[PDB]
């Protein structure tokens, strides 16, 4: 589901920056190591030259030229690794900007993601409320009210239906009552 | 405003509902009494 995928992408970015941080460690490891190499190399060059310089005056001259050839060969190795160092340096700062660029991407993606979810979730909640408030076209609570109101109207009808019979015998009987009723009215005329 | 509108709907629905039930229940009770009083057409106590 998109909710799950979306936060998963956030989680992925957290792994990514961690991977890039060690990758930084790997490149920097070679900067350190290649400093170490040049530092050694420059010593080695001097050292055997020093042996050779005494060897000029002392015993075998010829042997000193061998030591110098070894020295010089190694000097070439150092210069070759100086070439490699240049590649390291340039690549390193390229990687530094690439991390910063990714960090910007992540930062924006995360903030956008958060407000995207929030404003969407808020909107749907509002819509659910307006629907349930409104009942546009039809609203079931009124239909339930109506059902029991139909029963009221039925009972109302039925109640006056008992009245509909209740009247129609009585007129015979009532006439006898009214004769008696007139008598007490005649007693009032007597008292007057 | 939508809450206030609903609150009005609820308030009226409830008061209407209450008096609807009461007046209906009162009416049926009256009708039951008038029937049992009257025996219009026939009345079993007179038959006994």
DSSP state of B1: -
Residue closest to A41 by CA, chosen among A12, A18, A20, A70? A70
Q: Are B41 and A164 in contact (CB under 8 A)?
A: no
Tell me how far CA of residue A42 lies from CA of A17, A75, A151, B37, in angstroms: 37, 8, 108, 129
How many other CB atoms are there within 10 angstroms of residue A159's CB atom?
19
How many other CB atoms are there within 10 angstroms of residue A52's CB atom?
19
Tell me how far CA of residue A96 lies from CA of A10, A27, A36, A89, A104, in angstroms: 22, 10, 22, 11, 13
Helices (H), chain B: 2-38, 44-47
Q: Is A45 exposed, middle or buried (0-12, 13-18, 19+ CB in 10 A)?
A: middle
Residues 6+ apart with CB under 8 A from A86: none
Contact A169 B40 (CB under 8 A): yes
Tell me how far CA of residue A25 lies from CA of A19, A22, A97, in angstroms: 10, 5, 15
Q: In angstroms, rounded to a whole number, what is the distance separating the alpha carbons of residues A29 and A12?
A: 26
Q: In angstroms, rounded to a whole number, what is the distance separating the alpha carbons of residues A26 and A151?
A: 84
Q: Are A39 and A58 in contact (CB under 8 A)?
A: no
Tokens of A89: 């340096």
Contact B31 A133 (CB under 8 A): no
Does any CB of chain A come closer than 8 Å to the CB of residue B28? yes
Does any CB of chain A come closer than 8 Å to the CB of residue B31? yes
Q: In angstroms, rounded to a whole number, what is the distance separating the alpha carbons of residues A112 and A64?
A: 71
**By what technique were these coordinates determined?**
cryo-EM
Smallest CA–CA separation between B44 and chain A, in Å? Answer: 15
Q: In angstroms, rounded to a whole number, what is the distance separating the alpha carbons of residues B34 and A166?
A: 8
How many other CB atoms are there within 10 angstroms of residue A61's CB atom?
11
Contact B40 A130 (CB under 8 A): no
Specify the 3-state DSSP secondary structure of B41: coil
Specify the 3-state DSSP secondary structure of A29: helix
């Amino acid at each position: 589901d998109p909710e799950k995928v979306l936060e998963q992408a956030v989680i992925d970015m957290q792994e990514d920056l961690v991977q890039l941080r060690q990758a930084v460690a790997r490149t920097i490891a070679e900067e350190k190591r290649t400093e170490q190499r040049l530092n050694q190399d420059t010593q080695e060059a001097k050292k055997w030259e020093d042996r050779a310089k005494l060897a000029l005056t002392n015993g075998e001259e010829n042997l000193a030229r061998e030591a110098l050839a070894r020295k010089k060969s190694l000097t070439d190795t150092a210069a070759a690794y100086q070439t490699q160092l240049a590649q390291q340096r340039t690549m390193s700062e390229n990687l530094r900007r690439n991390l910063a660029a990714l960090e910007a991407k992540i930062s924006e993606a995360k903030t956008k993601k958060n407000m995207l979810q929030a404003r969407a979730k808020a909107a749907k909640a509002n819509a659910e409320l307006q629907q349930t408030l409104g009942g546009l076209g039809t609203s079931s609570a009124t239909s339930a009210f109506e059902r029991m109101e139909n029963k009221v109207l039925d009972m109302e009808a039925t109640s006056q239906a008992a009245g509909e019979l209740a009247g129609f015998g009585i007129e015979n009987q009532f006439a006898q009552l009214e004769a008696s009723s007139g008598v007490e009215d005649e007693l009032a005329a007597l008292k007057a």
